[PDB]
Each structure stands twice: as C-alpha cells, then as structure tokens.
Coordinates of C-alpha atoms and ligand atoms in Angstrom, one line a residue:
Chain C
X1 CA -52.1 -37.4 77.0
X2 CA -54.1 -36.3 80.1
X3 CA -52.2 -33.5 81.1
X4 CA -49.4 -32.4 78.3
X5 CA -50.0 -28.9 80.1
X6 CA -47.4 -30.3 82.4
X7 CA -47.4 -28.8 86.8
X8 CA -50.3 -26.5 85.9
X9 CA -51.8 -24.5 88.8
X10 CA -48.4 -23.9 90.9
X11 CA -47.9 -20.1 90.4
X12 CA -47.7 -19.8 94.0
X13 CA -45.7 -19.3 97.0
X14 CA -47.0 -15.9 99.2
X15 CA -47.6 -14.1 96.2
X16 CA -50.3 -12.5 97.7
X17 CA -48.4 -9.1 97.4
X18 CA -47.6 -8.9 93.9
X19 CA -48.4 -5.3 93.3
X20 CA -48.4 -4.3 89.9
X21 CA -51.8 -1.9 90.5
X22 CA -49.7 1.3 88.7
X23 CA -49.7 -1.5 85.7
X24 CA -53.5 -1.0 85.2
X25 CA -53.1 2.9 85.6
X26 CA -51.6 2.0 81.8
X27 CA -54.9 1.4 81.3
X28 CA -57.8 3.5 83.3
X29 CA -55.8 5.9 81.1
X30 CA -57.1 4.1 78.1
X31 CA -60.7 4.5 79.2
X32 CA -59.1 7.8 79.4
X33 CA -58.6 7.7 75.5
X34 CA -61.5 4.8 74.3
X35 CA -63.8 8.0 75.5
X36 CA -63.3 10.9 73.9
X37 CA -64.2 8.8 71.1
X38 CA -67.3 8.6 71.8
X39 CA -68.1 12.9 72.9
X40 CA -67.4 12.8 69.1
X41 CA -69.2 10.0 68.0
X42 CA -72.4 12.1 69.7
X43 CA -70.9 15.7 69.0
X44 CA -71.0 14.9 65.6
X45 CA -74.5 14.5 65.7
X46 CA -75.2 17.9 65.8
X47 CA -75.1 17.0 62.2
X48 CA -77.6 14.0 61.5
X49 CA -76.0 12.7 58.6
X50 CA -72.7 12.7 60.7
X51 CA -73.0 8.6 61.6
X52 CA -69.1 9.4 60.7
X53 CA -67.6 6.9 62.3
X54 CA -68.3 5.2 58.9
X55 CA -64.4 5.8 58.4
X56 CA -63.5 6.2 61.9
X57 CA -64.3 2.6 63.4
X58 CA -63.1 1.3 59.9
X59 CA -59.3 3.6 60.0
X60 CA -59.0 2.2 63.3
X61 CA -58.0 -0.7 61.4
X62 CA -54.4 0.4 60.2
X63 CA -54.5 2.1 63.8
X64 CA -55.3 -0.6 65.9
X65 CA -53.2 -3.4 63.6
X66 CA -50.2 -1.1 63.2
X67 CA -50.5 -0.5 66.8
X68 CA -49.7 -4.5 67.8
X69 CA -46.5 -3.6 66.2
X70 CA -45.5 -1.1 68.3
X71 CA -47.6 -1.8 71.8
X72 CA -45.4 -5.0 71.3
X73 CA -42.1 -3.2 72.2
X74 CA -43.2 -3.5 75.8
X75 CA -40.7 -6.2 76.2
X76 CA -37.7 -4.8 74.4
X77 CA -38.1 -1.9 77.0
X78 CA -39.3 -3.0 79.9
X79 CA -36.8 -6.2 79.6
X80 CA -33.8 -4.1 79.5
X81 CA -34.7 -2.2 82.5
X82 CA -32.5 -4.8 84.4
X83 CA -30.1 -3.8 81.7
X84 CA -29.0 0.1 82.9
X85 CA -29.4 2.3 79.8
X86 CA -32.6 3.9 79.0
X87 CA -30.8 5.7 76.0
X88 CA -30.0 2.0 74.3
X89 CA -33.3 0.9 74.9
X90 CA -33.7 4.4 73.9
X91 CA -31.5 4.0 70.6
X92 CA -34.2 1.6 69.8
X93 CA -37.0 3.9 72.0
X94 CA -35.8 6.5 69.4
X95 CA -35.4 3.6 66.3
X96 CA -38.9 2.8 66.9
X97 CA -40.3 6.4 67.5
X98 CA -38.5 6.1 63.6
X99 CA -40.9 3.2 63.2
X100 CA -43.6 5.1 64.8
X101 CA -43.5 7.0 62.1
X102 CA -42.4 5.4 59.8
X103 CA -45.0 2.8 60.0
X104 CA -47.2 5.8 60.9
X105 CA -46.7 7.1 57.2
X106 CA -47.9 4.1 56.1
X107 CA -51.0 4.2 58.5
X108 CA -50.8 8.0 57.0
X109 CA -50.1 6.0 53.0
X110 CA -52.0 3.2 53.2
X111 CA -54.9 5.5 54.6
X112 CA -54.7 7.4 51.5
X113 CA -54.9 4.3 48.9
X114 CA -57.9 3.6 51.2
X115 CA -60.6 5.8 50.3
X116 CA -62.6 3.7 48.0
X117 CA -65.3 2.7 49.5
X118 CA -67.1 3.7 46.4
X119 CA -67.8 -0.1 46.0
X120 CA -70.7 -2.8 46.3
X121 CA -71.5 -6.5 47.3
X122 CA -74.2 -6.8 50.4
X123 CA -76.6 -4.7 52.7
X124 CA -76.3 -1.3 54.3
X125 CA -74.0 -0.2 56.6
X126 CA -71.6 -2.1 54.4
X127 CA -72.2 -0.5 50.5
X128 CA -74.3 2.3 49.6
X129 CA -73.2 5.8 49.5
X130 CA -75.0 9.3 48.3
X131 CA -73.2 12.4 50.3
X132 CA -70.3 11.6 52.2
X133 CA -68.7 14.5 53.7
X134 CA -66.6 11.4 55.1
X135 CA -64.4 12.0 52.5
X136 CA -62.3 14.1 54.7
X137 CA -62.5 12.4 57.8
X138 CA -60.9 9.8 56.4
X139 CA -57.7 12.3 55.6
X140 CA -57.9 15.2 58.1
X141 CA -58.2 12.1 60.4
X142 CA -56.3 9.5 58.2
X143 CA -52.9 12.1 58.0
X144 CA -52.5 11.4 61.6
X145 CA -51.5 7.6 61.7
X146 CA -48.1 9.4 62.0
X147 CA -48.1 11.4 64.4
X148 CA -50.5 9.1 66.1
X149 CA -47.8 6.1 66.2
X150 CA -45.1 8.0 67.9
X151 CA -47.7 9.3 70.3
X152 CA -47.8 5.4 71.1
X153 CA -44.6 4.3 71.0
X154 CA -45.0 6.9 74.2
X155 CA -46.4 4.2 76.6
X156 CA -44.1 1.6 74.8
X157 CA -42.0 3.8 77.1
X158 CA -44.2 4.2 79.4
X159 CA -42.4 1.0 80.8
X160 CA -40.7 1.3 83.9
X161 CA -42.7 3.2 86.4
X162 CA -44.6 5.7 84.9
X163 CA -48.2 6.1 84.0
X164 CA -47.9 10.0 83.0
X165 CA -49.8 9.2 80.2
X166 CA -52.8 8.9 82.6
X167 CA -51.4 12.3 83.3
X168 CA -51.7 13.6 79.8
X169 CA -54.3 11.2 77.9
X170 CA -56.8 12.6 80.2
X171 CA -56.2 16.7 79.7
X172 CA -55.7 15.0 76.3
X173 CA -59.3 14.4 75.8
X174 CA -60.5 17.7 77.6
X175 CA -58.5 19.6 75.5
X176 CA -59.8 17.6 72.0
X177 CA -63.5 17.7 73.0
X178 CA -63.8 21.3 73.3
X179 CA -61.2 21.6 70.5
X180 CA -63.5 18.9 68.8
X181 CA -66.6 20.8 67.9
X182 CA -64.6 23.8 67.1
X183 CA -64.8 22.4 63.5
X184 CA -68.4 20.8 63.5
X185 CA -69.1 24.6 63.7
X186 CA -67.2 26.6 65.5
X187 CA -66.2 30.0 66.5
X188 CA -63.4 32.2 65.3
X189 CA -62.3 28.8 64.0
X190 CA -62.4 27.0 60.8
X191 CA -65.5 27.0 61.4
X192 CA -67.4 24.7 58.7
X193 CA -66.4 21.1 57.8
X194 CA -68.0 19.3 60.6
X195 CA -68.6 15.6 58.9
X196 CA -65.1 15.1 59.0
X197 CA -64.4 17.7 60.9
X198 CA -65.0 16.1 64.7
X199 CA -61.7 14.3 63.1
X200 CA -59.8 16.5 62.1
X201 CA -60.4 18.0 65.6
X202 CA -59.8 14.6 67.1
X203 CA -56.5 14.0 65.3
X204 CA -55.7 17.2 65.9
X205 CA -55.1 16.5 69.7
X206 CA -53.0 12.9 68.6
X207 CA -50.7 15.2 67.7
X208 CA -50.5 16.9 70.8
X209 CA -50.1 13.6 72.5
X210 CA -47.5 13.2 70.2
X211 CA -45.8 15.7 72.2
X212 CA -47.1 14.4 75.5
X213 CA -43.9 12.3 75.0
X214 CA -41.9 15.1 74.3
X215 CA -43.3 16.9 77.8
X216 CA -42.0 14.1 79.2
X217 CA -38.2 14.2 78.8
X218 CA -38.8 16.4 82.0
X219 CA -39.3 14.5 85.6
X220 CA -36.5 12.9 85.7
X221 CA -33.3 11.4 83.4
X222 CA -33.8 11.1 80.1
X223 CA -35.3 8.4 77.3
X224 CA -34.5 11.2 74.5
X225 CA -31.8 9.9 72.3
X226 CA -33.7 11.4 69.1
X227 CA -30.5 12.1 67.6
X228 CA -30.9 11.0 63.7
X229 CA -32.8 7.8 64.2
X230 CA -31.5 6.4 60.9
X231 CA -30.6 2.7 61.1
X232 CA -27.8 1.2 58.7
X233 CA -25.2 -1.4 60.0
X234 CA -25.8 -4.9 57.7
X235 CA -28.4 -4.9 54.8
X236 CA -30.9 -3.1 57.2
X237 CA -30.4 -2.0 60.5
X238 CA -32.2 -4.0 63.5
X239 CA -32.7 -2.4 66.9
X240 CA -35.9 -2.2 64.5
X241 CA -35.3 -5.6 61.9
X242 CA -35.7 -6.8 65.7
X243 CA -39.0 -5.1 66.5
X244 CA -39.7 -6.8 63.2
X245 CA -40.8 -9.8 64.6
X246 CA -42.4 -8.7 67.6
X247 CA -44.7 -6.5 65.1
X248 CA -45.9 -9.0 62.4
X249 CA -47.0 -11.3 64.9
X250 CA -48.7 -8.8 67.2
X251 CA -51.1 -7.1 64.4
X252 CA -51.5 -10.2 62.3
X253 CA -52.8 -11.1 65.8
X254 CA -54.7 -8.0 66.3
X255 CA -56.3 -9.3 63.2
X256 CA -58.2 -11.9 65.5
X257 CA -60.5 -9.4 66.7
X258 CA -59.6 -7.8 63.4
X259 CA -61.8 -10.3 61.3
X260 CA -64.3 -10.3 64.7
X261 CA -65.0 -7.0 63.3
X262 CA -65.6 -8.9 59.5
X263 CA -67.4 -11.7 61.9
X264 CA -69.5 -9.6 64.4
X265 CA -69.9 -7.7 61.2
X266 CA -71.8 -10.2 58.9
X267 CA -74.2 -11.5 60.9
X268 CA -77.0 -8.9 61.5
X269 CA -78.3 -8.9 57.7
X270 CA -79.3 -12.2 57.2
X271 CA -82.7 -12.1 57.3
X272 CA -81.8 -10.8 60.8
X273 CA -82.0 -7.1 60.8
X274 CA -83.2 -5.8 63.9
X275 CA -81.9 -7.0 67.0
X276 CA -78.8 -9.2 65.4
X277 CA -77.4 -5.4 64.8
X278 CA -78.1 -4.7 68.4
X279 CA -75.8 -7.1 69.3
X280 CA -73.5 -4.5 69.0
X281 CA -75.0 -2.4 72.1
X282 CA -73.8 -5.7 73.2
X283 CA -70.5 -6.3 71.6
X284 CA -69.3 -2.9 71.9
X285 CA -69.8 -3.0 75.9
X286 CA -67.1 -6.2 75.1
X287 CA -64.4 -3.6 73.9
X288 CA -65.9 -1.0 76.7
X289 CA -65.0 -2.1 80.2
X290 CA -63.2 -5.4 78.4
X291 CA -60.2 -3.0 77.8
X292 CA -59.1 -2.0 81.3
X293 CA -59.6 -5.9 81.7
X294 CA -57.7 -7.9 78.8
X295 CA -54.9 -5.0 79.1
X296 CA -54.0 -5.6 82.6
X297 CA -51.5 -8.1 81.2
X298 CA -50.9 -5.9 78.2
X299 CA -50.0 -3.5 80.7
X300 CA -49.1 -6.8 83.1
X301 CA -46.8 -8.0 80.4
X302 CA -43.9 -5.2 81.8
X303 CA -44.0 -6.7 85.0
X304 CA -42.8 -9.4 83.0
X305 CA -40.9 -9.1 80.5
X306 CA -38.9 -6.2 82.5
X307 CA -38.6 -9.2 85.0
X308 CA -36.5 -11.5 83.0
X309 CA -33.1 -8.8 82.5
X310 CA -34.2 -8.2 86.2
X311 CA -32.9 -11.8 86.2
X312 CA -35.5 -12.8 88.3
X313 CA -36.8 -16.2 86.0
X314 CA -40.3 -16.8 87.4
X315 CA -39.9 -15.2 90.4
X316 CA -42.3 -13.2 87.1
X317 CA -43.5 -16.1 85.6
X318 CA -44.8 -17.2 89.1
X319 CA -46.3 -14.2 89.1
X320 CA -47.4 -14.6 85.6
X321 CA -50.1 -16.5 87.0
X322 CA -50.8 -14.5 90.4
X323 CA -51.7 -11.7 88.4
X324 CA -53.2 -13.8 85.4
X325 CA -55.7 -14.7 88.0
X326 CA -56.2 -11.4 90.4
X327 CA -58.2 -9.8 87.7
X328 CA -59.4 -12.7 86.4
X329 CA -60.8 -12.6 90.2
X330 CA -63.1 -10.0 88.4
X331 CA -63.0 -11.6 84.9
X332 CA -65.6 -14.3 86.2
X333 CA -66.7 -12.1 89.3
X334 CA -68.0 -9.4 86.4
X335 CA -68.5 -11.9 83.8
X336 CA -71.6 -11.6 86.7
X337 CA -72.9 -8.5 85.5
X338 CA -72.7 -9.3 82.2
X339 CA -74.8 -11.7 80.9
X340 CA -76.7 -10.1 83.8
X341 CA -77.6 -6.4 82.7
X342 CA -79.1 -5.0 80.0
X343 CA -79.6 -1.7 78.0
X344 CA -81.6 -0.2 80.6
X345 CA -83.1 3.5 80.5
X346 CA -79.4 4.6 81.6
X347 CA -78.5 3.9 77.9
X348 CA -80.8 7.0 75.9
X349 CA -79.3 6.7 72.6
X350 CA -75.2 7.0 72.5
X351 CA -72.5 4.9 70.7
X352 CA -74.6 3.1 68.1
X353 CA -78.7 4.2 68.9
X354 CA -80.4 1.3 69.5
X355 CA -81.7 1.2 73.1
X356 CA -85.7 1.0 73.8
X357 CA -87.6 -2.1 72.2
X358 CA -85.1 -4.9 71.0
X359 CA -84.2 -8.5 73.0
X360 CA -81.2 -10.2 75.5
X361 CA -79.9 -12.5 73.1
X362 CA -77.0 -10.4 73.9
X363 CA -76.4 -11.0 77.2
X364 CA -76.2 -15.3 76.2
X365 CA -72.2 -14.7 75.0
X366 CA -71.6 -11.6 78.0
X367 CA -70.7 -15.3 79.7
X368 CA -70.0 -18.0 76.7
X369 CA -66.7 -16.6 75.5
X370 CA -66.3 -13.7 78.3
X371 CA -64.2 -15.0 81.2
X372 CA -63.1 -18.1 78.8
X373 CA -61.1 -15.3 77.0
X374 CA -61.3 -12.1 79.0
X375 CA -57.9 -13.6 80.2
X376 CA -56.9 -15.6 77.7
X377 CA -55.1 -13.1 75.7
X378 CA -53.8 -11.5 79.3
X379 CA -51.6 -15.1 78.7
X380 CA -49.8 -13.7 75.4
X381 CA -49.7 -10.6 76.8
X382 CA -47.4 -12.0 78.9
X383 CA -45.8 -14.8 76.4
X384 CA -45.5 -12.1 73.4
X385 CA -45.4 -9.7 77.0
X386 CA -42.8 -11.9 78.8
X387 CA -41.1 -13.8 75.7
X388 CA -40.2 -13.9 71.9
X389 CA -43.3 -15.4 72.2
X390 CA -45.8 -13.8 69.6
X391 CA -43.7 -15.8 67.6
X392 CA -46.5 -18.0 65.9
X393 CA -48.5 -16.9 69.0
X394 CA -49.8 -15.4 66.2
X395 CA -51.0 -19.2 65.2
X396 CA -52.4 -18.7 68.7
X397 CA -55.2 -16.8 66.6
X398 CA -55.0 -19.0 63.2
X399 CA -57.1 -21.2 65.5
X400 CA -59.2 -18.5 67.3
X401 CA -61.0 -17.9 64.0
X402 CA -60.4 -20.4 61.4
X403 CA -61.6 -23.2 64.7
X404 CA -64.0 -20.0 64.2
X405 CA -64.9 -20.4 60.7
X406 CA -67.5 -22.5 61.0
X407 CA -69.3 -21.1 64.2
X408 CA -69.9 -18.4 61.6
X409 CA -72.5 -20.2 59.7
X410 CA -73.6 -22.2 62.7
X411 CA -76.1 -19.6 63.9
X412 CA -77.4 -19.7 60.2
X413 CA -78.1 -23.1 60.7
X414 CA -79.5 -23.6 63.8
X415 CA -80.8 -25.4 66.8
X416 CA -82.4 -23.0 69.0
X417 CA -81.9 -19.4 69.7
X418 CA -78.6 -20.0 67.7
X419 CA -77.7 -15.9 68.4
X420 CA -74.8 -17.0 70.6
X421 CA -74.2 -20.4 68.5
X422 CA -71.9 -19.3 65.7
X423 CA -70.2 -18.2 69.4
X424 CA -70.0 -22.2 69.8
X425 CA -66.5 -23.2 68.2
X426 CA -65.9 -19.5 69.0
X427 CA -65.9 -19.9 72.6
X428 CA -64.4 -23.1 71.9
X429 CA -62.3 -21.9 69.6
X430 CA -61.7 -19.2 72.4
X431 CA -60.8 -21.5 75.2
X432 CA -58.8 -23.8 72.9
X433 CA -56.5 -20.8 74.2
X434 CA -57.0 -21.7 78.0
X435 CA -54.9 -24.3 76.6
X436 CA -52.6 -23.8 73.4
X437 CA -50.5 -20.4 75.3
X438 CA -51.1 -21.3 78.8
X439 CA -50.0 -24.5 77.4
X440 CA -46.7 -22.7 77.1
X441 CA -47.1 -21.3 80.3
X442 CA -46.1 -24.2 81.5
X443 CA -43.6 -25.5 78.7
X444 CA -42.5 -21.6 79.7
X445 CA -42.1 -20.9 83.6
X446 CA -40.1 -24.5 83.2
X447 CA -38.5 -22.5 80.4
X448 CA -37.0 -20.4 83.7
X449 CA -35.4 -23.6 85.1
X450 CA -33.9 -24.2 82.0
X451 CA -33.0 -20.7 82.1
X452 CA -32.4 -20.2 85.4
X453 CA -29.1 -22.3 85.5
X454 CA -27.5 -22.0 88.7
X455 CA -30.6 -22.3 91.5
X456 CA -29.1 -19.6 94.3
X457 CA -26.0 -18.6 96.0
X458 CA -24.1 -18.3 99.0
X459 CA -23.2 -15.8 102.2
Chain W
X1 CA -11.8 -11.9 106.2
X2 CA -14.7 -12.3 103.9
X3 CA -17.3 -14.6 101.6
X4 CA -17.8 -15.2 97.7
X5 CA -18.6 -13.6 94.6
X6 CA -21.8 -14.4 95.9
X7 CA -24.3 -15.3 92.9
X8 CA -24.6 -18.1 90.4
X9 CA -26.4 -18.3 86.9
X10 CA -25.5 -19.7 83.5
X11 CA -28.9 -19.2 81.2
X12 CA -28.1 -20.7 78.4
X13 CA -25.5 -22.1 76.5
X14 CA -24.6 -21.9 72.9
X15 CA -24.4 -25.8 73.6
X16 CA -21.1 -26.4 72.3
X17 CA -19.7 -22.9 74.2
X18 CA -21.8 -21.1 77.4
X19 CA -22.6 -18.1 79.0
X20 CA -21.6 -17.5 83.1
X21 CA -23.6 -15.0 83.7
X22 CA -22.5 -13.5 87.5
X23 CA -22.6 -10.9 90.5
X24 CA -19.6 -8.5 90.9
X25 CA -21.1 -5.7 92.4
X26 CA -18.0 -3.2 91.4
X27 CA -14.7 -5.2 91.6
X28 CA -12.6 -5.3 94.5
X29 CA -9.1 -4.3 94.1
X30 CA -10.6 -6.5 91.1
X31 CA -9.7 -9.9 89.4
X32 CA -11.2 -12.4 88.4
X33 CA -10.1 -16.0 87.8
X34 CA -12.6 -18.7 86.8
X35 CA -11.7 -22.3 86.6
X36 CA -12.2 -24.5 83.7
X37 CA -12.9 -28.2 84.4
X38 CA -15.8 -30.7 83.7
X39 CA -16.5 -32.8 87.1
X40 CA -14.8 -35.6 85.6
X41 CA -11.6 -35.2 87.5
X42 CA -9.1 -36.0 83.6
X43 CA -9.4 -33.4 81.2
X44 CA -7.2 -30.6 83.4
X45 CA -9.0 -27.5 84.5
X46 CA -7.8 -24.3 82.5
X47 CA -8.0 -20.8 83.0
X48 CA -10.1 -17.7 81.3
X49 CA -9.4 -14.4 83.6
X50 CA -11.4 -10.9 83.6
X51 CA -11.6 -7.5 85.3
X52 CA -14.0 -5.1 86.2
X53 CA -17.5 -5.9 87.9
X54 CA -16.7 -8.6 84.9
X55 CA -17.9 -12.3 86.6
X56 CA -20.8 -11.4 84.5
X57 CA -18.9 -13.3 81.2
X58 CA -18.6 -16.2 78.9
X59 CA -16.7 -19.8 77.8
X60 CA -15.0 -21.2 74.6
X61 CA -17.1 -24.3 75.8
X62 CA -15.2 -26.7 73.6
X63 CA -16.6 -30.4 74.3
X64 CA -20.0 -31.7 73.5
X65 CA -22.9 -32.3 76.2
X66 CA -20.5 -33.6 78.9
X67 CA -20.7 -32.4 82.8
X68 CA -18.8 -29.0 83.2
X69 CA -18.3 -27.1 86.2
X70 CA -17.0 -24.1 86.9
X71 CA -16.2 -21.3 89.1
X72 CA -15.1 -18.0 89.8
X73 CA -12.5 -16.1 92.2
X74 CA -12.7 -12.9 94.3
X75 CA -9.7 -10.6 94.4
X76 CA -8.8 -7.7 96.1
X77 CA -7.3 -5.5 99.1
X78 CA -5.0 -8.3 98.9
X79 CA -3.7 -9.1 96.1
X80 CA -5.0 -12.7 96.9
X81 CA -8.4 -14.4 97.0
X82 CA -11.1 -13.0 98.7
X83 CA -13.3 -16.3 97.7
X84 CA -14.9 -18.9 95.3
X85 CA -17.8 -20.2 94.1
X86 CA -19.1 -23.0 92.1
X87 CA -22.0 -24.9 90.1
X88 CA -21.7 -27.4 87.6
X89 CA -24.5 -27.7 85.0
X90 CA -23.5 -29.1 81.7
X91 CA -24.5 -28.9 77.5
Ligands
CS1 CS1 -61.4 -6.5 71.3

C-alpha cells in the first residue's frame, strides 16, 4: 500500500544500445500519410464552401476505430517471427487481409447507414445543413474503408524489418495530391465534383496503397499466402476468432480519444465561442507531432511482442522500459516547446483557420496531460504491443474518460481560467495510467520470470 | 568428446501437466531421452523419448504442485550420449 507497483524503475542493465530507430521509420511514414490530409483539407478550398472535412474528420471514425483492430495484429506477427513461417503468420497475414476487408466492408457498410447527418440538437459545426456537396465525400470517400483496411493490415506486416511503407506512403501522397485536385476541377479528368471530390481523389490513392502491399511480395521471400482466405474449422474459424480479441479491445480503446473527439468537441459553444474553438489550433498540434511520438511504442510494440517467440522474456520487457523512456527523453524535453509556442505568423490560415487575434489558453494543457500521457499509451502499446494485454486494457480507458467525466463540466464551473480544468481529472484521469498499465509493467516483466522458467544454460 | 543440449526453459505449465520448451539446434545422429522424476528421490523417474531438433516438447505432468525436475539427453555419432542437462522448477 505504498508501492503495489512492485521493483519499479529497474529496466536496466547497459541498455544504452537498444536500437529500435527503424521502429519509428513506422512512423515518420505516418507524418508521411497524417499529411496529405491536410494538401486536401486546403486544396479543397479552392471551393469555399468545401470545409469538407465535415465527413472526413467524422469517417475517420470507423477508420481510425476499425483500425485498432487491425494495427493490433502487431503481436500475432511480429511474435511469431521467432516462430519461422511468415506464410502461417501469413495464413493469418492473409486471414486478416480477409478481415481487412471484411471489416473494411463494414467500414465500406456502416459508412453507408451513416449518412444522416440530416439531424439536430446543439450549435454549428455540429447541426445545421443547407448544400452539402458532402454527400459524396462521404461515399466516393466512405467505399474505401475496404480497400483502405487491407492497405493497413500492410504495416501489420510491416513487422519484421521493413519500413517500405515509408517507401510507398510517401510517393503515396505525391501521387494522390496531384491526383487529388484532378477532381476539384481537373483536366481531361472527371473534372467536376470537387466537394467530395478531393475524396474521391484521396481514397483513390488508398487503393493504390492497397497494392503497395501487393508491390511488396518482391524484395525478398514471401508473406503472400492469399490463397482463398476463407476460414472454417469449429463454429468459426480463428487465426481471426483470435484477432478477435486483440480488435475489440484496441478500438473500443481507440474510443478514448474516440469520445476526446465528443469531449474536445463540446466544449467551445458554451457561451465560449471564440477562442474555446481555437483550442483546436491547439489540440490538433496534439495529434500532429504527438503521432510520431505515442507510436514509437505502437511501432515499439514489435520490438516486443516479436521478442517474446524470440524467447528472449524481458531481455524485451527490460527494454520495454529503455525505450518507454528514450522518447519520453523528448516526451518531457518537447513537452518544452509546447506549452511554450504559439500560433505564430508561420501559421497563415491552414488545418482549421483560426490564427491572428485569439489567446494561449492553449498552451496551459501542451504540459498538464502531455508528457503525463504522451507515453502513457506507448505502455499498452507494449502490453496490448507485448501481451494479450488489451485485454481489459481496454478498462485502461473506462477510467481515462469516465475518471474523465466529470473534468468535462469542471471548466463550466470554475475556479479560474478553468480552459485547462475540465483537463483536471483528465490529466489525472490521464496519469492514473502512469499507474494502472505500468502497473502491470511490473506485475508483467515479473510475468517473464514466471515465464522464463529455466534462468540460463550451460557450455 | 563434447557438452549438453545446452539450453533450459519451461514457460508455463498446464499446472497439472508442463511444457519443456528446449535447444536442439538440428539433432545429432538424434535422440532424445528426458528423465522423469520430482527431486524427491521415491516416486521412480520415467521416461518420455523424442527425435528430431525435438528437446523443444512437452510432459503428461501427472501429480499436483509438487517439485519436479527434469532433464534431457544428447545423442549421436555414437549411438550413446553426447550429454545432459537439468533444472527442476515445479507446479
Ligand atoms: Cs490522439
């Protein structure tokens, strides 16, 4: 009852050289694909009336939550790469790309049932609706989510040495922006629907991602066993019932930050207008440069997981800290330019125009929950990313928001300059997670004594 | 003229029965033998016996939580023992 966290900081030995830096190249190829995004965002603004995203960072919900799912394979095939076949983890690699697909016409289903935001409660940029010629972004951009999950479950086989989706996802975006404004209005092209039509441009180059994975049976042998990827063997088929329960808890758990979006969301019209919504110049620089951060580990979590069938049983878990904390070197050491810099005159008008003439009541949670999470889902990426454990890891995050719910309507309610005060219990909601996984991260690397069962050998 | 089957790991049981989970890097001419005693001395040792690079197996691990140990045999060129190895580490 002082320390239930039991032998907490030893994670060290002369780890010094753990050198998983090609395990963040699965990520500065994400800033790779977090930025075409945006040379659509302001390429559809040729047309005025195309703020579009208005289905586009509200799909990105069946994306993002379906991804989990898949993103949370990482183990299955990193893990048995000290098994030896490639084309068993590739039975499931291929049972999954099923999934991914599968799934990913339900992300292309679901997306359908969507479109009915022809609906009303509370204040704009959450009701209203005259023209939308979003319609159609939310199909010629909501039929991907198929081909879109495959051309994920890609770096969920990305695991094991390569990050030539760094290779692709970066002529992927090249190749999308020019093809992007083909359709806003184009040339020889289809040239007309442009509100909707950035996306179907966009979504058209997913599915040449899609087949970024199948330009990559090709450097060396194989991960292609797409022979029928049907399933069959009890009542349903695992190899996929087993990614099962590495999906519902990843998503359900990428609906954290999924009602941080239904959070972050609701408080700016209060009688709060104008700068509350600018704190989402703010909160959107949180996603920006927080993603080659937090997905270190997600990209960490190989280095891991592949580590265990490598029967090496915290000689990863030992390093489960010495990489936990290299970036978190920078995870306090640029929480420093955080709730340091603002919106300068090197932001004009981009993601979401709000730049000249609005306050830094932004800047006062770029520190309160930054480095006290920044890392602090790098741990489940790396518990999910090492074990089973997403398990309820996902009631890692039934805390993380309902030990949230009420620093929601404590900064409507407040002491002071209360902007950063409903982030009270929500950056203590958010580093009751420096305990609860990392927590077990220490019922966990002494899981690997318990595993590790004979303690060496002889000569 | 040589050393053990030169590893030793047994994760986890399924704590009435175990897994032995052990180097063979190839075979040699290739045998296996792997005793089958607690440390209490009574209860005779028994045998289980595999092949290939096949030290890498598993036990009918009868009794309840009581100290087993167990190990496994080399064999090769000669048709004899080429050496053993031991831990002990129980339920
Ligand atoms: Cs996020």
């Amino acid at each position: 009852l002082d320390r239930f966290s039991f032998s907490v900081f030893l994670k060290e030995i002369r780890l010094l050289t753990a050198l998983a830096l090609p395990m963040l190249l699965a990520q500065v190829a994400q800033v790779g694909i977090g930025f075409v995004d945006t040379v659509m965002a302001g390429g559809a603004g040729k047309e005025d009336l195309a703020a579009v995203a208005l289905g586009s960072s509200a799909f990105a919900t069946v994306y993002i939550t379906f991804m989990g799912i898949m993103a949370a394979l990482n183990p299955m095939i990193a893990q048995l790469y000290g098994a030896g076949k490639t084309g068993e983890a590739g039975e499931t690699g291929r049972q999954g790309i099923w999934f991914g697909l599968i799934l990913g016409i339900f992300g292309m289903i679901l997306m359908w049932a969507a479109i009915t935001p022809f609906r009303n409660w509370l204040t704009l940029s959450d009701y209203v609706e005259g023209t939308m010629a979003q319609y159609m972004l939310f199909t010629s951009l909501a039929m991907p989510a198929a081909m879109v999950h495959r051309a994920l479950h890609a770096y969920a086989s990305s695991l094991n040495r390569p990050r030539l989706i760094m290779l692709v996802s970066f002529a992927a975006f090249v190749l999308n922006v020019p093809l992007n404004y083909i359709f806003v209005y184009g040339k020889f092209g289809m040239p007309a629907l442009g509100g909707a039509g950035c996306g179907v441009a966009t979504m058209a180059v997913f599915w040449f991602s899609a087949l970024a994975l199948w330009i990559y049976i090709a450097k060396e042998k194989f991960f292609r066993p797409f022979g029928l990827t049907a399933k069959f063997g009890k009542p349903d088929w695992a190899v996929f019932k087993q990614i099962w329960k590495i999906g519902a808890p990843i998503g359900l758990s990428y609906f954290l930050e999924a009602s941080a979006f239904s959070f972050i969301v609701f408080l700016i019209a209060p009688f709060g207008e104008d700068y509350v919504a600018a704190q989402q110049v703010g909160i959107s620089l949180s996603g920006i440069l927080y993603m080659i951060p937090q997905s270190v580990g997600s990209a960490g979590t190989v280095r891991i997981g592949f580590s265990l069938g490598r029967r090496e049983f915290s000689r990863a878990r030992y390093i489960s800290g010495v990489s936990l904390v290299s970036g978190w070197v920078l995870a306090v050491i640029t929480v420093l330019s955080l709730v340091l810099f603002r919106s300068p005159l090197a932001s004009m008008y981009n993601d979401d125009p709000a730049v000249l003439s609005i306050a830094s009541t932004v800047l006062l949670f770029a520190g309160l929950f930054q480095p006290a999470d920044f890392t602090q889902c790098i741990a489940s990426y790396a518990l999910r990313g090492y074990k089973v454990t997403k398990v309820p890891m996902f009631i890692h995050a039934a805390a993380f928001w309902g030990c949230g719910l009420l620093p929601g309507y404590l900064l409507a309610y407040r002491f002071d300059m209360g902007i950063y005060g409903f982030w009270t219990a929500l950056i203590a909601s958010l580093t009751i997670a420096a305990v609860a996984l990392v927590w077990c991260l220490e019922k966990y690397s002494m899981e690997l004594v318990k595993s590790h069962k004979a303690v060496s050998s002889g000569l | 003229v040589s050393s053990v089957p030169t590893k030793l790991e047994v994760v986890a049981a399924t704590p009435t029965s175990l897994l032995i989970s052990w180097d063979a890097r190839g075979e040699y001419v290739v045998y296996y033998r792997i005793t089958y005693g607690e440390t209490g001395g009574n209860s005779p040792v028994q045998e289980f016996t595999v092949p290939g690079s096949s030290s890498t197996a598993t036990i009918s691990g009868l009794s309840p939580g009581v100290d087993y140990t167990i190990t496994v045999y080399a064999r090769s060129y000669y048709w004899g023992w080429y050496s053993p190895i031991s831990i002990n580490y129980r339920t």
